[PDB]
Design a protein around this ligand. Structure first.
Ligand SMILES: O=C1Cc2cc(Nc3nc(Cl)ncc3F)ccc2N1
Ligand SMILES: O=C1Cc2cc(Nc3nc(Cl)ncc3F)ccc2N1
Ligand SMILES: [Cl-]
Ligand SMILES: [Cl-]
Lengths: 4, 124, 124, 4
């Protein structure tokens, strides 16, 4: 999961 | 927005769509390319091809379970492009590049047409 | 094999599938979550959820155009997860995390359950 | 395009  | 994003999600969805295709699950159309038949999902075809997008958004054609392609289309070229749609991998070879490019132009797959033109230019 | 791969293909396919959903093109199922209705593509639901995979591979249920979910399922939680399926982005907030996690456990979306558990652990 |  990432900060888009 | 304040969303988080799962990097591998799109690739995992496509891998599962290809597993459904392999297992002939919920395939809803047969594409006929002369003597050969290819089963697929209408939504995946529309998502990848400008030609299929136009066909399946048409009020009469959206209901067809069989689509016959132009007789000049090579079945191997189509098979290579169908595999690309479901996997992101294009099996491009010196022996198939002209058929693949011609099929991608017909199917309106601009990114495939672009890489074929570049590989052809490098050979000249 | 000797394939080349188009990095953005899977993301571009998913973006187009979400555009078809927006425009209600070739949606073939309605998911009912108490008083709310959500239209979607059976193949995308199966590709993302272990619950929908089991439902639409069942010989009787694969033919249904309406699926009613358990009344304990929160429509907002479902809406957030449906948007995630079509976009890879999860709108996780302090006010919805418990409903989202409960819905993801029911839908069998292991990667979503994993991130919810981690965000909950960080709060404790 | 890349070599996968
Ligand atoms: O080279 C290409 C690939 C391609 C795919 C599509 N697909 C869709 N386009 C839109 Cl805007 N919404 C939903 C779709 F399924 C249309 C045109 C083109 N041309
Ligand atoms: O957390 C999850 C997400 C998820 C999706 C699927 N989907 C499919 N699985 C296979 Cl092997 N082939 C085709 C599919 F559409 C099954 C189980 C699970 N569990
Ligand atoms: Cl393309
Ligand atoms: Cl997941």
């Amino acid at each position: 999961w990432v900060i888009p | 927005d304040s969303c988080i994003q799962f990097t591998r999600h799109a690739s995992d969805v496509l891998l599962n769509l290809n597993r459904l295709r392999s297992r002939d699950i919920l395939t809803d159309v047969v594409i006929v390319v002369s003597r050969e038949q290819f089963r697929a999902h209408k939504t995946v075809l529309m998502a990848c091809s400008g030609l299929f997008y136009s066909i399946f958004t048409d009020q009469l054609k959206c209901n067809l379970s069989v689509i016959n392609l132009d007789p000049e289309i090579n079945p191997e070229g189509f098979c290579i492009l169908l595999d690309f749609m479901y996997t992101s991998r294009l099996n491009l070879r010196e022996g198939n590049i002209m058929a693949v490019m011609a099929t991608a132009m017909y199917l309106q797959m601009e990114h495939v047409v672009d890489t074929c033109r570049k590989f052809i230019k490098a050979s000249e």
